[PDB]
CSV table of C-alpha atoms and ligand atoms in Angstrom, one decimal:
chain,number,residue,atom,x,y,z
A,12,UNK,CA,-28.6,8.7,-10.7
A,13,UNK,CA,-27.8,5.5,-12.1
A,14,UNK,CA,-30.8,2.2,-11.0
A,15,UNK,CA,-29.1,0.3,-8.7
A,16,UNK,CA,-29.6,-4.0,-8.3
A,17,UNK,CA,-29.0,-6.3,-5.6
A,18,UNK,CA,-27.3,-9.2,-5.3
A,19,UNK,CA,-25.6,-11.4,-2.4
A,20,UNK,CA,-22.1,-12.7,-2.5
A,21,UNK,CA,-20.0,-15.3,-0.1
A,22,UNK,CA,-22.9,-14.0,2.1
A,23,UNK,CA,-22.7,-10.1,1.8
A,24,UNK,CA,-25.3,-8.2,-0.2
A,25,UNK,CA,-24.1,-5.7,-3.1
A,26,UNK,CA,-25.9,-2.6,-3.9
A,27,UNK,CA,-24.5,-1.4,-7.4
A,28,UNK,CA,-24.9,0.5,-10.4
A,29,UNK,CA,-26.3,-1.7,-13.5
A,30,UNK,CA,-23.6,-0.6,-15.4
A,31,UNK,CA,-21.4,-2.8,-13.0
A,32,UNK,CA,-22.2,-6.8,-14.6
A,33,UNK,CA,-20.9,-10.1,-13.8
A,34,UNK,CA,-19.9,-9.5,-9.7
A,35,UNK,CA,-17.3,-12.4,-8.8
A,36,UNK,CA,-15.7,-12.1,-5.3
A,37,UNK,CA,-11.7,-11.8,-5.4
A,38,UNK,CA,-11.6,-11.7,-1.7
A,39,UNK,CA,-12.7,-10.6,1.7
A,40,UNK,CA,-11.3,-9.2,4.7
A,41,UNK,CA,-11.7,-7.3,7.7
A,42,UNK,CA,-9.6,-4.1,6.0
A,43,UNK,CA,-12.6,-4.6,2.7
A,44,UNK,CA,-14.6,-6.9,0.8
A,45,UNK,CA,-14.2,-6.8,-2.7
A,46,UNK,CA,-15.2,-8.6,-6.3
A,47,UNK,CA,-14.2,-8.1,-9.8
A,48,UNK,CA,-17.1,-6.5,-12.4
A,49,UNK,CA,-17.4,-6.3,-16.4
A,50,UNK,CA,-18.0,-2.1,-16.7
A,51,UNK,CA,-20.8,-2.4,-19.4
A,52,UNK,CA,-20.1,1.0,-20.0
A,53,UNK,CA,-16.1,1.2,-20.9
A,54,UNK,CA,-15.7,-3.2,-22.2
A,55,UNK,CA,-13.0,-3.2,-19.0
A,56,UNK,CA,-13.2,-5.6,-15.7
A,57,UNK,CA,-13.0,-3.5,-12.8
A,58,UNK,CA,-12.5,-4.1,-8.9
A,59,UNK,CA,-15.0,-3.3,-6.3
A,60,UNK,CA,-14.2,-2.6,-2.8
A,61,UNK,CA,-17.4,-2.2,-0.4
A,62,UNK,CA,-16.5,-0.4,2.5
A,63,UNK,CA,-17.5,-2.6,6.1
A,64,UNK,CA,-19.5,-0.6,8.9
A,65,UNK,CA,-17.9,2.6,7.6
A,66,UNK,CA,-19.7,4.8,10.1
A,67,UNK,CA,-20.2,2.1,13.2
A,68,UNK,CA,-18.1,4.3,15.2
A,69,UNK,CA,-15.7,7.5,15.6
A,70,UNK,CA,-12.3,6.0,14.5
A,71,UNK,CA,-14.2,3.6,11.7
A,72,UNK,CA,-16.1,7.0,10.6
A,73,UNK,CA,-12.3,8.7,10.7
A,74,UNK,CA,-10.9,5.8,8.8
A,75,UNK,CA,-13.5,5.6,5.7
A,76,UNK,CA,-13.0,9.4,5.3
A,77,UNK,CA,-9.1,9.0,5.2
A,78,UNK,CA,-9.4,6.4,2.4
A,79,UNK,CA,-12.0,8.2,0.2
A,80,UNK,CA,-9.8,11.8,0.4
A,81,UNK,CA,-6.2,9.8,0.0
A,82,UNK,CA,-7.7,7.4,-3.1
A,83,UNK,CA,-9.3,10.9,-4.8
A,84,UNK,CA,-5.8,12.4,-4.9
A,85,UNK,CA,-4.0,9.4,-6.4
A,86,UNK,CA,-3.5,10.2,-9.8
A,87,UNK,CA,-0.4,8.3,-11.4
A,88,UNK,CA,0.6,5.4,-13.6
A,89,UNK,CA,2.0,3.2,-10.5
A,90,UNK,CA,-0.7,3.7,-7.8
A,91,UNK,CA,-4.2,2.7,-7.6
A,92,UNK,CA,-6.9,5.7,-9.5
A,93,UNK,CA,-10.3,5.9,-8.9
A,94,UNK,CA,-12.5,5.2,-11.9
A,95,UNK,CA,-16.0,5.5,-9.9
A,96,UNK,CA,-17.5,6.3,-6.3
A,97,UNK,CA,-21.1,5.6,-5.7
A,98,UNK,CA,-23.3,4.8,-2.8
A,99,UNK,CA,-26.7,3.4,-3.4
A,100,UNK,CA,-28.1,6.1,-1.0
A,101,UNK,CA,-30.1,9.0,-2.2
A,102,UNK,CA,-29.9,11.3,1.1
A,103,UNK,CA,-27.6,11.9,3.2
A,104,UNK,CA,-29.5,10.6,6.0
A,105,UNK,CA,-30.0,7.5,4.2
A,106,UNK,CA,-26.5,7.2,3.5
A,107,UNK,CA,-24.5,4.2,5.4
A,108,UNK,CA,-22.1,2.5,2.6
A,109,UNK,CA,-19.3,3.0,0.5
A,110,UNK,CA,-18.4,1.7,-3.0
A,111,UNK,CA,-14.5,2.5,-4.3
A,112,UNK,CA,-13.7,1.0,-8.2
A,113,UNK,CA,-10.3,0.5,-9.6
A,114,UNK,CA,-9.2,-0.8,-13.3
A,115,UNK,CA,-9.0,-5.0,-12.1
A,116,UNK,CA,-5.5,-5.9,-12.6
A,117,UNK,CA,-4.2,-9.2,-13.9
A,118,UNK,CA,-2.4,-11.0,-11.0
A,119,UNK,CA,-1.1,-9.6,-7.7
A,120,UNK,CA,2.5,-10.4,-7.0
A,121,UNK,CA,1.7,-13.4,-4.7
A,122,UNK,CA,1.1,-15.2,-7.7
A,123,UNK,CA,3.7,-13.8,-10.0
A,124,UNK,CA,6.4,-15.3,-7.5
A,125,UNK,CA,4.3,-18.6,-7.5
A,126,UNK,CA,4.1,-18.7,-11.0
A,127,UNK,CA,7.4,-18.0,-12.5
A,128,UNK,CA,10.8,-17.7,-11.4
A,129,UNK,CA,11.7,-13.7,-12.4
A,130,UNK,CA,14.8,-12.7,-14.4
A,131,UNK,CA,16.9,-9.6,-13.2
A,132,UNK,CA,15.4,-7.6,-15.7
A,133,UNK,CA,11.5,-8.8,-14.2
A,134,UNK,CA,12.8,-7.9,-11.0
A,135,UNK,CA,14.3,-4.2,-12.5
A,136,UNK,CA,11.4,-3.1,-13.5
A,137,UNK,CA,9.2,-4.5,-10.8
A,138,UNK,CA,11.0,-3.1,-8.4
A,139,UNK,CA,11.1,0.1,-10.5
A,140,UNK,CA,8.0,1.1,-11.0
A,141,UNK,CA,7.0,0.4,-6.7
A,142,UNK,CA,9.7,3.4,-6.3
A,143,UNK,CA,8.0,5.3,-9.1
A,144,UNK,CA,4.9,5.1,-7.2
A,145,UNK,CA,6.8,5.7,-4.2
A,146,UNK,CA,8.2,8.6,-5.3
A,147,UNK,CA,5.1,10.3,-6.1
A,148,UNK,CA,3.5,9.0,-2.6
A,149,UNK,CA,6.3,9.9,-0.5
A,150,UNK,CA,6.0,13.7,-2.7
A,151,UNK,CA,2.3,14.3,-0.7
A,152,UNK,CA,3.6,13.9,2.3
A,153,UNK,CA,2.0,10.5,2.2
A,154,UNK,CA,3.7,7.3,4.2
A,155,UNK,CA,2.2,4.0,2.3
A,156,UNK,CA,2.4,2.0,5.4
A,157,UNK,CA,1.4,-1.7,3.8
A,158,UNK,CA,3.4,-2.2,1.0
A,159,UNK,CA,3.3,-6.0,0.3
A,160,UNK,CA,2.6,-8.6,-2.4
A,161,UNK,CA,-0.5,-8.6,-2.0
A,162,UNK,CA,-1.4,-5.0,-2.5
A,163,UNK,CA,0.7,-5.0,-5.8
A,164,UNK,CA,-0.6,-6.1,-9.3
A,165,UNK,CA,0.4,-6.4,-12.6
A,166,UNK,CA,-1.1,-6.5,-16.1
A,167,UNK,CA,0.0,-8.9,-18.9
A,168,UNK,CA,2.5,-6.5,-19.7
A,169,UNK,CA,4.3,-6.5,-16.3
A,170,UNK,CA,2.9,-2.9,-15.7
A,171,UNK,CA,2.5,-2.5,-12.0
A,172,UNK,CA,-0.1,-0.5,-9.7
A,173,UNK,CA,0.1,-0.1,-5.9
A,174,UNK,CA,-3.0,-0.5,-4.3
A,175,UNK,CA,-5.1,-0.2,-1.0
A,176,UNK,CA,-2.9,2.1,1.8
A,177,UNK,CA,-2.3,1.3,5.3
A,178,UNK,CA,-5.3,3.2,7.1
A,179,UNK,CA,-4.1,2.9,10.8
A,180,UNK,CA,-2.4,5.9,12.1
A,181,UNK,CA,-1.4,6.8,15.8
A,190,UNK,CA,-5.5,-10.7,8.8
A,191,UNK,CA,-2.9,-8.6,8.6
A,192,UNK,CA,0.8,-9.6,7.4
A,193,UNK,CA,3.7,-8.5,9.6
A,194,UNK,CA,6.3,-10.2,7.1
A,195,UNK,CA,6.6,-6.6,5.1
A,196,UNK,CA,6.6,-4.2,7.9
A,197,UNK,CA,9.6,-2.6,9.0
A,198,UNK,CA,10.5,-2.9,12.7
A,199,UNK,CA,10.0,0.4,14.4
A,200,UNK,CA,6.3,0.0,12.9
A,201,UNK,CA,6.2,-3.4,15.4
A,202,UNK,CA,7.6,-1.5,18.2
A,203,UNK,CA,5.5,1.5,18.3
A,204,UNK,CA,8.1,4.2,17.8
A,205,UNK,CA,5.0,6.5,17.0
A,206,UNK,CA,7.1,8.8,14.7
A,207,UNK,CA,7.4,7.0,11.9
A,208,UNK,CA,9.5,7.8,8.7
A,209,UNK,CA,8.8,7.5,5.0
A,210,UNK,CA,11.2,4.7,4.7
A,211,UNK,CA,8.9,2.8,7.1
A,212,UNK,CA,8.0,1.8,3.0
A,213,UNK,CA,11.2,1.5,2.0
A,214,UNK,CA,12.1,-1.6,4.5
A,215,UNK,CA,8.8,-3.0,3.0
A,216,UNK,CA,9.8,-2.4,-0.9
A,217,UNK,CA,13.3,-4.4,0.1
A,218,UNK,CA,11.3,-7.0,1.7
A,219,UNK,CA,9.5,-7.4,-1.6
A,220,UNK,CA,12.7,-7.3,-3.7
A,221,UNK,CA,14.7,-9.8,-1.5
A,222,UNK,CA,11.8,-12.0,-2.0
A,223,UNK,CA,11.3,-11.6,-5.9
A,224,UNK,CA,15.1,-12.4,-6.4
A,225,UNK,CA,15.1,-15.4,-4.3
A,226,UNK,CA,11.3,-16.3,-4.6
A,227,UNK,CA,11.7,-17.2,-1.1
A,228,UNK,CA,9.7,-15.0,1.9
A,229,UNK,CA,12.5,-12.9,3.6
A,230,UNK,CA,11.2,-12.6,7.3
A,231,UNK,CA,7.9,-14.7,7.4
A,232,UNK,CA,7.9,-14.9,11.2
A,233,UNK,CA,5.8,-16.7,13.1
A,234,UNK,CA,4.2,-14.2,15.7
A,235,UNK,CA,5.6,-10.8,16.4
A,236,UNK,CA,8.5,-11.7,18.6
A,237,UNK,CA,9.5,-14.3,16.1
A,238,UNK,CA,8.9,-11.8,13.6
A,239,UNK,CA,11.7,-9.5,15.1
A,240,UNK,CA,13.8,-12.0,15.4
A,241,UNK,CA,14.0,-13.3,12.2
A,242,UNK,CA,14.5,-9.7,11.5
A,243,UNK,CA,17.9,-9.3,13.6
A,244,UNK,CA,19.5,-12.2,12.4
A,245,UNK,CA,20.1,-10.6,9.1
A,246,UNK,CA,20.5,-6.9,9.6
A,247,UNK,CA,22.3,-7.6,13.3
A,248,UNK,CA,21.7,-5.9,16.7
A,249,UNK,CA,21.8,-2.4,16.8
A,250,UNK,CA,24.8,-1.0,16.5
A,251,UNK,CA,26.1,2.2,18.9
A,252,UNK,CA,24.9,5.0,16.9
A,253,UNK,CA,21.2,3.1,17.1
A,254,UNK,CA,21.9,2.8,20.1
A,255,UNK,CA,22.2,6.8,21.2
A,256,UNK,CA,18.9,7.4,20.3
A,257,UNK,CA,16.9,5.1,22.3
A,258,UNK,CA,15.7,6.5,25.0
A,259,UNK,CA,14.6,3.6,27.8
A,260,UNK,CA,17.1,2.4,29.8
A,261,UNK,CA,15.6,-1.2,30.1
A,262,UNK,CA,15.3,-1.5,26.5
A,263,UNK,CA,18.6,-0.9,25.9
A,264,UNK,CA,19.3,-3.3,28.4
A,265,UNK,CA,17.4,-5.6,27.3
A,266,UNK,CA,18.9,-5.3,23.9
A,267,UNK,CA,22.6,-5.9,25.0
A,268,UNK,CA,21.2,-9.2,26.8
A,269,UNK,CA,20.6,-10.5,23.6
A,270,UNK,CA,23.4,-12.6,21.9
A,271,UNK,CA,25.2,-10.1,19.8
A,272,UNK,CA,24.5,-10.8,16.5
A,273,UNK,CA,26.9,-9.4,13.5
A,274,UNK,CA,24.5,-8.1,10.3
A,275,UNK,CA,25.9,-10.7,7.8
A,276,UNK,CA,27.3,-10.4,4.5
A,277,UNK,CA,24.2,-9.6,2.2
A,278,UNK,CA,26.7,-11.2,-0.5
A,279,UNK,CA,26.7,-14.2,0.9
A,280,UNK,CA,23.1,-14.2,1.6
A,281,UNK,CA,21.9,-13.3,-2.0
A,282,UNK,CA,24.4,-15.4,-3.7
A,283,UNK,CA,24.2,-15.4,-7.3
A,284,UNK,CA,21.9,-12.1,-7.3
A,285,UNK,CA,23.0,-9.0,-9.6
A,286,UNK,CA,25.8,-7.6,-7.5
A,287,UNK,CA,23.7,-3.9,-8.1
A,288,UNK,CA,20.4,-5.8,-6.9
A,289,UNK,CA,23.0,-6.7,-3.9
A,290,UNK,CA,23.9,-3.6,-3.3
A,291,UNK,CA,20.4,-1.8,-3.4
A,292,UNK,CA,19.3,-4.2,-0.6
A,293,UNK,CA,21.6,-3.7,1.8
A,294,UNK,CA,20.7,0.1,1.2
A,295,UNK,CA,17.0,-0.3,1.6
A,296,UNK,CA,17.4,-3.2,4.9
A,297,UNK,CA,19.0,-0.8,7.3
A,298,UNK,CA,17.9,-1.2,11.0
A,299,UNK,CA,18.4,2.8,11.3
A,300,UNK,CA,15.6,4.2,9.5
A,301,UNK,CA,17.2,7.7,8.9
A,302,UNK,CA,20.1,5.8,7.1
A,303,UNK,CA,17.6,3.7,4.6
A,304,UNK,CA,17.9,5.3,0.5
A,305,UNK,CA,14.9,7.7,-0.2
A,306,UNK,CA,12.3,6.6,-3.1
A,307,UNK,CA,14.8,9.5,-5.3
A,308,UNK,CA,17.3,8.0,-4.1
A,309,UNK,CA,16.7,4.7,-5.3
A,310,UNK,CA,15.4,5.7,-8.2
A,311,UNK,CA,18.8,6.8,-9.4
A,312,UNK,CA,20.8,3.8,-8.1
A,313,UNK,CA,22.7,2.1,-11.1
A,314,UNK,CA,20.7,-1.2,-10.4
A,315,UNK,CA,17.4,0.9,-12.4
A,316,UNK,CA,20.0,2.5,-15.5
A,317,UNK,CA,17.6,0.6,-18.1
A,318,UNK,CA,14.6,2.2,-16.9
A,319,UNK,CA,15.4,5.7,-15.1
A,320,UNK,CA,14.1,8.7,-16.5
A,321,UNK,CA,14.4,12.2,-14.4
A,322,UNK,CA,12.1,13.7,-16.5
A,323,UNK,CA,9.0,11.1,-16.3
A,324,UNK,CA,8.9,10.0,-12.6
A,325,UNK,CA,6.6,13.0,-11.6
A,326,UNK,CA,5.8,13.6,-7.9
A,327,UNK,CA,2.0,14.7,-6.3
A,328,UNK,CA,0.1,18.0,-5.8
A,329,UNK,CA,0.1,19.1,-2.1
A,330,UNK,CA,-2.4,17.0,-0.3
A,331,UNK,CA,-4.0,18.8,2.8
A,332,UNK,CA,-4.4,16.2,5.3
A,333,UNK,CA,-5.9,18.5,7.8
A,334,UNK,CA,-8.1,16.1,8.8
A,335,UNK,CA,-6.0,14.1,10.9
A,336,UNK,CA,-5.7,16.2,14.3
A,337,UNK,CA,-9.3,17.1,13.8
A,338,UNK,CA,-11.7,15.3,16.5
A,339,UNK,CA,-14.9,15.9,15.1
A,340,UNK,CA,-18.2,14.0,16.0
A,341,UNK,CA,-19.2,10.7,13.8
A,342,UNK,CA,-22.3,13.3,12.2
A,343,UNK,CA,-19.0,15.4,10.6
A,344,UNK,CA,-16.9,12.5,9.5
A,345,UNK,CA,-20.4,11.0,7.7
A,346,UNK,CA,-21.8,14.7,6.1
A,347,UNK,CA,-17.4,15.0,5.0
A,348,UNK,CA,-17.2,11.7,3.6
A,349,UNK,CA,-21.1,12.5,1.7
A,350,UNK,CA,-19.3,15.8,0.1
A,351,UNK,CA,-16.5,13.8,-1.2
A,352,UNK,CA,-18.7,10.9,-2.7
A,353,UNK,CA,-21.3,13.8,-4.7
A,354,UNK,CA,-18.0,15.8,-5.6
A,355,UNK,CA,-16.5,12.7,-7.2
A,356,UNK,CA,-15.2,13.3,-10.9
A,357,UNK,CA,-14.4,10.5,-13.1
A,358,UNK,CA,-10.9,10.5,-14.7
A,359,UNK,CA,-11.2,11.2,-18.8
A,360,UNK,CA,-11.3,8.1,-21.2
A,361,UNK,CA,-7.5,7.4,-22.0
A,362,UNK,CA,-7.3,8.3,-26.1
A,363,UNK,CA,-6.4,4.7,-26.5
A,364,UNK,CA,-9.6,4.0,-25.7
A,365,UNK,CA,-11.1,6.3,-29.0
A,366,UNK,CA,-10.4,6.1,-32.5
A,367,UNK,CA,-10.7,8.6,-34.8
B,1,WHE,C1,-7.5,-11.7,-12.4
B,1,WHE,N1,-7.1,-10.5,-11.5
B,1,WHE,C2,-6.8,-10.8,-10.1
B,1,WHE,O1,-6.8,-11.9,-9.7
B,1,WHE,C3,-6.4,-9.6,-9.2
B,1,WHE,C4,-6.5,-8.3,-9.5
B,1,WHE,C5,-6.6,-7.6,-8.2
B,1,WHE,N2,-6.9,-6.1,-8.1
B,1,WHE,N3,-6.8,-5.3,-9.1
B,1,WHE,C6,-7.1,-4.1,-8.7
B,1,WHE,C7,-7.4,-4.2,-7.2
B,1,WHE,C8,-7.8,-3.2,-6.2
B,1,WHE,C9,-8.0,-3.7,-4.9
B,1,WHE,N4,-8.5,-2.7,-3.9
B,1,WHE,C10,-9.3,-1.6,-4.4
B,1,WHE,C11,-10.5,-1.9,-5.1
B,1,WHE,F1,-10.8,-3.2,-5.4
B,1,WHE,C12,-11.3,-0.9,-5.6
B,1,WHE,C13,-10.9,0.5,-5.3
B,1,WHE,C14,-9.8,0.7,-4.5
B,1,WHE,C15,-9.0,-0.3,-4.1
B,1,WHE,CL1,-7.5,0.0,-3.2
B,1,WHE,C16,-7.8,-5.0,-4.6
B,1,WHE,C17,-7.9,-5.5,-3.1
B,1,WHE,N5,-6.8,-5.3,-2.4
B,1,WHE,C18,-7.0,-5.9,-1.2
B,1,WHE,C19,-5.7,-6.7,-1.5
B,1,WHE,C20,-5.9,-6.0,-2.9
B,1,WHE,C21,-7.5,-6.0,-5.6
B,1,WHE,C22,-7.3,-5.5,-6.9
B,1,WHE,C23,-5.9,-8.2,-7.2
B,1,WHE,S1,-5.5,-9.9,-7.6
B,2,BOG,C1,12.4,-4.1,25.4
B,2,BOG,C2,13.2,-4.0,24.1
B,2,BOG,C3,12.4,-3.2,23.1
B,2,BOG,C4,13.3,-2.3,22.2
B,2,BOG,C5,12.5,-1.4,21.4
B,2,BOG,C6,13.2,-0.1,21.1
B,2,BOG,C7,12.6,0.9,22.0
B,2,BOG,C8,12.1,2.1,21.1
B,2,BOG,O1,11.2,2.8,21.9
B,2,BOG,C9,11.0,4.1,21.5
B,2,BOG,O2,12.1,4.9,21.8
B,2,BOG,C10,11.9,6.2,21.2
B,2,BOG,C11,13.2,6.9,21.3
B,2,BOG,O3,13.6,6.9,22.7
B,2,BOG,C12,10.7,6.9,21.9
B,2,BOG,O4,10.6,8.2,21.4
B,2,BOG,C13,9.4,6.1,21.8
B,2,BOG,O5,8.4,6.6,22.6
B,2,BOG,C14,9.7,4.7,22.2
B,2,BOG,O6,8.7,3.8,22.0
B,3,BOG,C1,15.7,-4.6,18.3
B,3,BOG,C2,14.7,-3.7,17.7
B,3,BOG,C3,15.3,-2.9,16.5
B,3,BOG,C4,14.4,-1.7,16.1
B,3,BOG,C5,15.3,-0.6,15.5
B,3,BOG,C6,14.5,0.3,14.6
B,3,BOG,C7,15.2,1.6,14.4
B,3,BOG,C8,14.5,2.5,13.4
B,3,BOG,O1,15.1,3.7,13.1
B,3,BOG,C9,14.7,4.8,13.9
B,3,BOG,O2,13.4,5.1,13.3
B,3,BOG,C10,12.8,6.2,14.1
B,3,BOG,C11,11.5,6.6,13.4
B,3,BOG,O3,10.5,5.7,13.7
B,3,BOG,C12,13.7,7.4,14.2
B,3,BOG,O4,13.1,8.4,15.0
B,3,BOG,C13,15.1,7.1,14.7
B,3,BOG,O5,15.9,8.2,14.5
B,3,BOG,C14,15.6,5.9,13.9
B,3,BOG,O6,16.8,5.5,14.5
């Protein structure tokens, strides 16, 4: 067992490994706190997330378990990989915090799109390697559920990683998150992410937020105004009278001409979009899919876009007392196996 030292940051204390130098607090929030290190030990910066109150209560103990077990399986160039788990706890009786490490990326693309204008080309491969990671996601039976600028980074080389996952299941940005999501359709498709990744795109081309509503009605409406009302076939399969009522008292809006609204975008990056923003989500373009769309010929390659090993999530129709989810997540902490040193990282 490593020695552990304390120190407080913005007001919460950090328990860590010596190993782990230099804490500086990137940000805080409800979801995690987390700071940026200097790992003595490998001469990289790494991220830190501390996980809040993870065992305060049933869904809370639920939740850190679901994050722990999904970030252990993540093992590919586009999405976030664990580099360390620890907890300063010696016992499992003593045990009541979690500490998740991550390579620290450069800039997140909040900034990107502050800093620069991006080329086509920028916004290719950008855009390509969130359906690479996608692709391998979606391939575990995985949905993302948070895709947004802010939990997407890049290194000086414009090499992108996906991070933290949307951990609610049955503060927070609504400008990313596709519809159904906001209306609690409760069966919820893959391409819940894929109305998130054209979100992203439309904003990257543009530089310009595509749907940064207000509140969640304004959110919605924003939302309409561009794709249109739904149309008959949407229509069909929504069950509730009064909300299809409700829907046809609403001025009938035609989806307009994505064309027109993109002007002066790559006619492919045009025609990607309007693939990706459908109200139906069963007629949205798969991660595949997209990955073969013309708009990604420079970078496409069938034979290095590799999906996931079957994850068994289990777990989630199990109700099992706070004890369980604590002595589960325990198991997973101790089981914890370092990925290897890249051979970049040796010489001879
Ligand atoms: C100079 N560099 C910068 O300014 C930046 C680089 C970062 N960066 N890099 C990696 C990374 C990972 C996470 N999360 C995380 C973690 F920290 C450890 C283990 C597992 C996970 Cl999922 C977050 C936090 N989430 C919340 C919104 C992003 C930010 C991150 C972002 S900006
Ligand atoms: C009041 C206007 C709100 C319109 C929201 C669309 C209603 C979607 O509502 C959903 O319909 C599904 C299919 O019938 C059901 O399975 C879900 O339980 C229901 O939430
Ligand atoms: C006015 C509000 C517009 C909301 C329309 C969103 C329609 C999303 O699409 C729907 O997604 C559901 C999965 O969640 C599927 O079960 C339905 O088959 C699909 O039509």
């Amino acid at each position: 067992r490593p020695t552990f030292y304390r120190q407080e940051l913005n007001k919460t204390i950090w328990e860590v490994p010596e190993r782990y130098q230099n804490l500086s607090p990137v940000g805080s929030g409800a979801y995690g706190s987390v700071c940026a290190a200097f790992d003595t030990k490998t001469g990289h910066r790494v991220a830190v997330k501390k996980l809040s109150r993870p065992f305060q209560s049933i869904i809370h103990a639920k939740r850190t378990y679901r994050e722990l077990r999904l970030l252990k399986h993540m093992k590919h160039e586009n999405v976030i990989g664990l580099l360390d788990v620890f907890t300063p706890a010696r016992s499992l009786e003593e045990f009541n915090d979690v500490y998740l490490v991550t390579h620290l990326m450069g800039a997140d693309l909040n900034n990107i799109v502050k800093c620069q204008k991006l080329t086509d080309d920028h916004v290719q491969f950008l855009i390509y390697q969130i359906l690479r990671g996608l692709k391998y996601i979606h391939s575990a039976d995985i949905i993302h559920r948070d895709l947004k600028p802010s939990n997407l980074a890049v290194n000086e080389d414009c090499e992108l990683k996906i991070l933290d996952f949307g951990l609610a299941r049955h503060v927070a940005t609504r400008w990313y998150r596709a519809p159904e999501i906001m209306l609690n359709w409760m069966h919820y498709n893959q391409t819940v992410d894929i109305w998130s990744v054209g979100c992203i795109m439309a904003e990257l081309l543009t530089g310009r937020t595509l749907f940064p509503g207000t509140d969640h009605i304004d959110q919605l409406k924003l939302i309409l105004r561009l794709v249109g009302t739904p149309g008959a076939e949407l229509l069909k399969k929504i069950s509730s009278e009064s909300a299809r009522n409700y829907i046809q008292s609403l001025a009938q809006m035609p989806k307009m001409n994505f064309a027109n609204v993109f002007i002066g975008a790559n006619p492919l990056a045009v025609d990607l979009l309007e693939k990706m923003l459908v109200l139906d989500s069963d007629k949205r373009i798969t991660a595949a899919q997209a990955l073969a769309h013309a708009y990604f010929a420079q970078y496409h390659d069938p034979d290095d876009e590799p999906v996931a090993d079957p994850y068994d999530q289990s777990f989630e129709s199990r109700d099992l007392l706070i004890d369980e989810w604590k002595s589960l997540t325990y198991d997973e902490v101790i089981s914890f196996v370092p990925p290897p040193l890249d051979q970049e990282e040796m010489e001879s």
